[PDB]
């Protein structure tokens, strides 16, 4: 009962006369909503990961993924992928998220260097031919491809960079192959003393053991939740309930609140609306393009008015700053909040236990 909730808060079996703050209430959500865009069509992940021929690492390919449904569970669970390492999401969560885009990058490297792909690494892959940004958000996915790629005399069609004037920046692409002048003399034409071609080709023959063997790498990079999602995880959208407290999920923007018709004239390019607080206060539904205000679910302090246990066990409860309709015979609305278990009387008295906004409570016949 509210009295034992005071005894617990005061840590006393006996309570002195007064109004006591106790564990504050919050209106619980009635159900959940999901709203993702009603795209039907799976993404070209087959065309990324089963591709007939990958690029060399210096020649690293980028494919866009956009306007589709992305079932990353099928990647994460596939025994074939030998490393699957993630740097800003956990893979089991990928199916719950929505992404603005994915840049799916594909290329081949030697299997010993599968540790060099991680953001902030050092070593020739990381420095001289393919660098991730240090805040890379995405997952690096790799497997040994000897069994399809490798040839007894060696598929020297696959290449990596040995020389560069500087370590490259994140996602720099270099199609140039002109001579690296390691000597103090510059040098025109195809060769010279300490003049080099910047490339070396992998001797990918199956007589080389693991580590020296070829390792296909796909890097998926994405940015999240802050803009119109083009690609999302496979989740069914629900009906959009309104005017009731609810756990909403719009495009992975999870939250709890009451959803109301919005009078905000968003322009066609907007999708989230934001308060002065730097918090989302409106959203465009992704299946019907109407704006909804996200008002917070009602909440407030719960104070128990105790006339003192030397006098009585009876108590009245103030739900601070809320209506008399939100808490579900002796219910009184006050400016201080909804007061439950005290009777309103027209007889003024001296102040006794204060409630706020001119209201005061007391124990009488």
């Amino acid at each position: 009962d509210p009295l034992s909730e005071t005894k617990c808060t005061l840590k006393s079996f006996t309570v002195e006369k007064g109004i006591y703050q106790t564990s504050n209430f919050r209106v619980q959500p009635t159900e959940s909503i999901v709203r993702f865009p009603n795209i039907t069509n799976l993404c070209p992940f087959g065309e990324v990961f089963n591709a007939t021929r990958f690029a060399s690492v210096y020649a690293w390919n980028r494919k866009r993924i956009s306007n589709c449904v992305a079932d990353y569970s099928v990647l994460y669970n596939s025994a074939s992928f030998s490393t699957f390492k993630c740097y800003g999401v956990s893979p089991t969560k990928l199916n719950d998220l929505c992404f603005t885009n994915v840049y799916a990058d594909s290329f081949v490297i030697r299997g010993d260097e599968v540790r060099q792909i991680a953001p902030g690494q050092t070593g020739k892959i990381a420095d001289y031919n393919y660098k991730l940004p240090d805040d890379f958000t995405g997952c690096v996915i790799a497997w040994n491809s000897n069994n399809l790629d490798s040839k007894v005399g060696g598929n020297y069609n696959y290449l990596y960079r040995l020389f560069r004037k500087s370590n490259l920046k994140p996602f720099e692409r270099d199609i140039s192959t002109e001579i690296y002048q390691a000597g103090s003399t510059p040098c025109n034409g195809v060769e010279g003393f300490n003049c080099y071609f910047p490339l070396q080709s992998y001797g990918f023959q199956p007589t080389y053991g693991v580590g020296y063997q070829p390792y296909r790498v796909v890097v998926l990079s994405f940015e999240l939740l802050h803009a119109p999602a083009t690609v999302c995880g496979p989740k069914k959208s629900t009906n959009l309930v309104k005017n009731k407290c609810v756990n909403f999920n719009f495009n992975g923007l999870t939250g709890t609140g009451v959803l109301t018709e919005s009078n905000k004239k968003f322009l066609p390019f907007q999708q989230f609306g934001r308060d002065i607080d730097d918090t989302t206060d409106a959203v465009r539904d992704p299946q019907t393009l109407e704006i909804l205000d996200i008002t917070p679910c009602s909440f407030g302090g719960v104070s128990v008015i105790t006339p003192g246990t030397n006098t009585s066990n009876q108590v009245a409860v103030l739900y601070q700053g809320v209506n008399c309709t939100e808490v579900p015979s002796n219910v009184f609305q006050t400016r201080a909040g909804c007061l439950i278990g005290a009777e309103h009387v027209n007889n003024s008295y001296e102040c006794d236990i204060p409630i706020g906004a001119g209201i005061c409570a007391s124990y009488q016949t």
Binding site: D275, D277, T279, P296, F299, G300, G301, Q320, G321, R335, A336, C351, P354, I355, G356, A357, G358, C360
Partner: peptide, 22 residues
């Protein structure tokens, strides 16, 4: 003289009608 964060403003015990009355 002129929300999700968990902030609230409590009313004064004495309203401006009662301060004016005193």
């Amino acid at each position: 003289v002129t929300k999700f964060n968990g902030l609230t403003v409590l009313p004064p015990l004495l309203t401006d009608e009662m301060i004016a009355q005193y």
